Design a protein around this nucleic acid. Sequence first.
DNA 1: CTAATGCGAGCACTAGTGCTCGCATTAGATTTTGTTT
Lengths: 628, 1170
Amino acid sequence: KEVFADYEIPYFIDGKASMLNHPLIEFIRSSLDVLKGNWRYEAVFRCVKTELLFPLNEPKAKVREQVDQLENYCIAYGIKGDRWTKGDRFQYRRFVSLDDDFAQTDQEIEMENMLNDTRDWIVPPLFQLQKRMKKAKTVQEKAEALYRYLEETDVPLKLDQERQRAEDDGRIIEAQQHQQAWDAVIQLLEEFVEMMGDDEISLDLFQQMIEAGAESLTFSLIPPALDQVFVGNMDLSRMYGTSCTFVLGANDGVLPARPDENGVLSDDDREWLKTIGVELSSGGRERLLDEHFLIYMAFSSPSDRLYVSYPIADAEGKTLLPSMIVKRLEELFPHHKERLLTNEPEQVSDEEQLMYVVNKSVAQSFTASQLRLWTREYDISDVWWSTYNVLMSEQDRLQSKKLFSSLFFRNEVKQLERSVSRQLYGERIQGSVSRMETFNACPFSHFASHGLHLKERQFFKLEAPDIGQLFHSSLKLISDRLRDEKLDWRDLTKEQCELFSYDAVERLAPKLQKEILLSSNRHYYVKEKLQKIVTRVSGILSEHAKASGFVPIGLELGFGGKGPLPPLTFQLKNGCTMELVGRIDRVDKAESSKGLLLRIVAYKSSDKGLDLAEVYYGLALQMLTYLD
Amino acid sequence: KPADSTWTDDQWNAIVSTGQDILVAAAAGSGKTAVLVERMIRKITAEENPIDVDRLLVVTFTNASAAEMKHRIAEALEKELVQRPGSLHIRRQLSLLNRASISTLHSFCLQVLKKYYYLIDLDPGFRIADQTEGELIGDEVLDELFEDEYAKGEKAFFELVDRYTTDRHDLDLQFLVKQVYEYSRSHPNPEAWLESFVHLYDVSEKSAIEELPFYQYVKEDIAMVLNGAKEKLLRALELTKAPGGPAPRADNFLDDLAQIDELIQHQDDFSELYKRVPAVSFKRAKAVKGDEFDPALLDEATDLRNGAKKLLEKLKTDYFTRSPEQHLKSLAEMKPVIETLVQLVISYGKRFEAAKQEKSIIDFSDLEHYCLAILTAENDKGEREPSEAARFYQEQFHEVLVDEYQDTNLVQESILQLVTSGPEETGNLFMVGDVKQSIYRFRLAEPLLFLSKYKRFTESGEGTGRKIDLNKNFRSRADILDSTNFLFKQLMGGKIGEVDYDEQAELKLGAAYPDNDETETELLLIDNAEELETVQFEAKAIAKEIRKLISSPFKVYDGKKKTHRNIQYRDIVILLRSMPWAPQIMEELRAQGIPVYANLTSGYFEAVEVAVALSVLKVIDNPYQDIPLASVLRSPIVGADENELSLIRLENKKAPYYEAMKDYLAAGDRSDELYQKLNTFYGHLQKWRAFSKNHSVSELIWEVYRDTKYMDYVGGMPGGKQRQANLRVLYDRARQYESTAFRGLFRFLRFIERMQERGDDLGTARGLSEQEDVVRLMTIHSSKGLEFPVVFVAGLGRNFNMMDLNKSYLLDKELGFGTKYIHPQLRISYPTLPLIAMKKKMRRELLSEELRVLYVALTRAKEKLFLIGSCKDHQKQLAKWQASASQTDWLLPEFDRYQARTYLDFIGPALARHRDLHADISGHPARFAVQMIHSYDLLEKSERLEAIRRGEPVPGSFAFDEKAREQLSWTYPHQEVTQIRTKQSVSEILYRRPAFMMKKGLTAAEKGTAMHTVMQHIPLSHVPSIEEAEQTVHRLYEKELLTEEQKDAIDIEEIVQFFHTEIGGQLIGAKWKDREIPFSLALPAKEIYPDAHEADEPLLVQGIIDCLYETEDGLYLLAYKSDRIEAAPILKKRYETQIQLYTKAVEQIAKTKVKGCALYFFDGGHILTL
DNA sequence: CTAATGCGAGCACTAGTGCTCGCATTAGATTTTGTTT
Ligand SMILES: Nc1ncnc2c1ncn2[C@@H]1O[C@H](COP(=O)(O)OP(=O)(O)NP(=O)(O)O)[C@@H](O)[C@H]1O
Ligand SMILES: [Mg+2]
């Protein structure tokens, strides 16, 4: 289908096509899955993406975009099950800060409204279907439920519209198949109730039967045209007046074909039944022998020309062996030369390379490859320079030019223009040590991150940074509580450490990563684990306080922004100013003979410390900045 | 019967012998496979009593080896056909060769399942899942199980979790259950093996260590190090005797010896070793001062003594930092935890099987286990009774032939034992193999299975199975055989290697090769003296030597029958232990014009084209993904630069990147280039969007390639061939996954994403096929059974994969699941005795196999062998190599070989005592060529180019200008009629509701057709009454020509009225009459369509004429219509063209004129004439 | 793992001064084999 589309060869396939790619069938199947799996992510959005749930006469592009954002939301927040059907309005937050306040913004409100509005037209027809279906006991009332589900969502009208759009764009064959689909479904239901209508059946089996029936469904044959290539098979296809015949895939095991003993009666069974006088269908031995007649009829079907081809490798690269008929043919015609078929033109004669230039697209395709090969100091055929020149004389030589620009393709980046960079990062670069470190790792990564603000798709998943924030915030909470009760880290007992750690984590859990620590029993245990960690850490810090001459001045002490300490400012020659704002984990003071002493302590979720090499290359700059 | 041949008497023995189970044991290249084939051919092409090919089961483990056997059998068979072209039997066999049972054992298993699905809980239409989809289902069920267990909240579950997970998450327990399950699947009875775990932990304080099974491996370990220490000190003692050697320290060494010997006397008493070993102290080394002592000798003795110390301290820390009573206590304490693990794993398996059954899929594992389930009827703890299916295969198969039998595990052996006929003493089992080539320990393929039968069988076939040894090699030149033999006499023993490499086992020349001057085995040792990864240096050395072999031509001897062949790239083969080195090797060899082929299974998704094409697919699925969108925009697909990108961002900073793009389009003017890029892309996006919801993933992918020319484009950049290949297989892989469980864009992408997210990968595509003339890179495992003229073996300095030895747990076939003592509350962990025991056991088992792996590798070569490795420093390593080889015995010290981490730790000291780097050792006919390579030694303007850049045609004249021009301007002469439907309807020139939703029948079409049926069946002899009409209708109701509802929907008056009409009367009174006239008419296409051609085929119009009658005036046409009326000029035009079609049909086909046409309407009995 | 670093102790030689001995910690090191169609 694809290749003949490209080479502009009209054809007719002696075979019906499956309906399994049609939106209707997938709508029915995935809706049933929505009911069966209890609104799983994959089921719900498989269903929605077929667009048959889309509000009537709303712009498909717009509805699509709204669905897309709802999908991203459902992934991010782990939406599944009765969460869809409960009615509890979907709430939406943009950023995760354990320190911050819950309070929403204008944007977040606007968004939340959009998400819920989309939800409110997605759920009802599906939820109603779930109602009726649970209620329905017999095949007929379940079929009634399903059909009314199709009818309420205005499926017939949506299909009709689709059909007219296809007709308008000239895709008439694609346009007819919509009605074909509807009729197939209706027929399936009709026969289902005709045979088993009054029988009481389970959703599981009803879905099984619908699934099997759908898996059988097929579109009618495209009616033949006046002038096409006939592509068919070697056991059922019939032809008349054929001049040229291409027999394909003369591989071992394929032609002659290995018989299929799939079935209730084995070869031995059929053989013995034959000996007692029962005549059934042929056996493996006989079919395998009849293959020679099939081959004979194929080989003797054209009047003028016969081609017999075979692939040496499958699409994965695995070796394919010639069938015996290739050798048989070599015997009957020992002075016949075997032709090579390849997509590497440099392996055949000039005259054979010329056969490649059949149309603009194919010629473009091959010319590009040949040009590459040519830059590898290969004397490519003159076929391709001629082809090239013609493509450059053509009216749309620009397209081919863009194609052949691949010759000089290097992954080059253009430095940002003054105006653009200034406008992008702003007059005053507000950033953090983190950002500068990213830049020092790779300028482009800094560009994608802080220039283009490219966010990666969010998941309902507890990652390391979130845990880190939990640890930090927990220690802070314990620290503040310690000052409130006139307690000091030295004066902590084992019981106190445990209590404070537990209470702190408990407070922070609802705030962390869209309440994921409350989302399951497995996560309840992750939460307990985190509590054990905070407890032991509290104990350790308690021991260290009892042995240090340093006392913490500040904990999570923010610099710049609106915190205590002022930012670290830099004057850039453009007039643009750079301002670095952030938060020091801990600062300790201690009196001494030399004077007042300050040290910086950072809570890291790793084992390693400070590498002076990384500091030199600007990969590790936080600590020394805080000390500075 | 004895016969003259090219066959050795041993070989002929194996070919003709019958009557019992037969095992053929022989070194590499002996003709084991050749013999298997010839045995078959002889059984098939016999004169006395020939058998058909389908009465044999020919089985091996690997798909490649099965392909080989298939190949050899085919060749030999048609070869026999040439000798006797008249035989119907032989041609019959070449036909049957398709249906022959010659394959992998897994393929056979598939056949068994397919036939006998009904004996087990299996759907006949079942499918084999691929690795990732199976494992994804496993991930789902494991998550489900874990959640359920957390919900129960049973104390034991938390007790297990706490011990085998980190402080942050429980993923490690996940991996643990997966691993234990997978391992258990290599046992004939997985759950029994799992349930045997606890018996290791069922100890007490009153137990004796030495009487526990695992202690065996402890017993060995101690024995090896103590002796190892003794052996060391003795050398330090012998050094005291040397002229330079330090005499005084003798009294030190003899003391140490006496202490170490004192330990040896109590090796069997663990409880005594606990008292004595930590109590051992070596008295301070006596200082030797003067110029009489060799400095080097002093230091050498010191080194050895310190070696002894280290050995003891290792022994002490391993076993004697804890009392035996304490060891037993920790062990026993671990017992409850193990029980929870066992029941957890068992649940997973059950739930896992359930999940797969639902989706009607199976593992590779389910192949073997379900096959075994089918083949058994009764199973009493190993004693398996054959079921009906088993009996079928026992009858069907006259003999079962197994090649590479040393790869047979206990599960496969169970299967073979069920498909074979008779006991060992009188069975039909023929097996060839070699214990030295046993290299599937990760599959639980046991050397013990081979060795047991080999020790049980006798050379005479009486009372038991017959064993047959083959001594002669017919594959390699003596250079290879000698290098191999010389190496493995020193490395492979019974202790390390698990096989005694004695005289019976050595390779013996039996192939005649005209000598070559350079065929000496080469050893290229590369150094790191004075930004390239070592694999690259290695690859450079390889390529250099390959081109050396190409510049001086090589001679390939078809010794089988007599003819030379010039060396092809085909002939050279590079062997590796594992493929993570392969890509970097291929890149460097490709960079030097050397064609490379390699079946890769990783690296696909890091190719930029793949990332880009995938990004497109993702954007089509959901554009609101900033990174894939940005990827597509920056890719050559669109060609937006960094400025244009930030420019898009400027339109909307806070929103998604897609929103910003839409905004740019909304505000931009059509004169901007950026606008044009983005608008073209957006149009494409929306098009593809609509497209994917109606077509498959693969159709979408091709359409994307078509609209973007990205595959074309990519074919024009550096690495174009590989890149185009990658995109091609993106299409084909989409095709396979669509067809399986991931139809449609959303499902497909989700599959790919989940695949990558759990570390699964796919291989980069291939360009040249395996058949073609290419240097093949392959694993040493894959090469087993095959032969090549030249062989490189690379990565000899690579460490052995010993990751398993460092976890907190360890799996053992014999002993089960060994673990550290772990206490989640006390926060302490330390190895138990069985863990240490298993670690020791496993280390020596692993080293043994790696040795065998090397043997397979070296024995692949026919004429040339290259050994390539890498080290930090040449001199230091040579020093290390000589400091192990002063011994005069062939076999290197056990402990030293035990200490090996790389292949060079083996080959090194074995090569040290050679002249090239005791006349028995140094005067071995082995020739080694040593190259001590260093890392460093291995490493305008064009008119047309600028013409291409400018988009200008290149200047010149070319031989194919006119033809290229003419073909690119050509159009098909008959293009306009290629889409015109041949068959046409007279009409040609609604979404209904289901039956069960509507009222009871009786529609317009129903009644109309019900009347039409009466009109074509009512007698026309005379005008009928109402009674006669009702009678006809009734007859049509009893002939089932008219349903009951059809019968009751009849207006008898309406039809009777027709016969009171004029046209009706003329109908009754006609010369000749006919009704329901079918017709086909051929109208030239121009009449229906402008632009058709006289040559172009006519269109075929088809219909059915209701009635035709002939009077003395002419021929008249009649038609009935149930059209609603109670209108004439409207009905006239409504059916005008139809009537014209009918008339033209009659006029043209019947060659008769038609005077007058009539249409009768049932409503009101109207008749209009045309 | 293993190799190097350093610090302190003792044992032995011809009380101090050498050098073996032992302990404890970083630093660098390392980069899987097969089973289907
Ligand atoms: N009697 C013989 N005379 C001549 N060539 C022989 C003879 N027997 C075997 N060969 C050839 O020697 C080579 C080795 O045979 P092969 O069947 O691969 O042995 P093998 O035991 O299977 N090797 P391996 O699988 O590695 O253990 C092949 O090329 C055979 O054709
Ligand atoms: Mg073999």
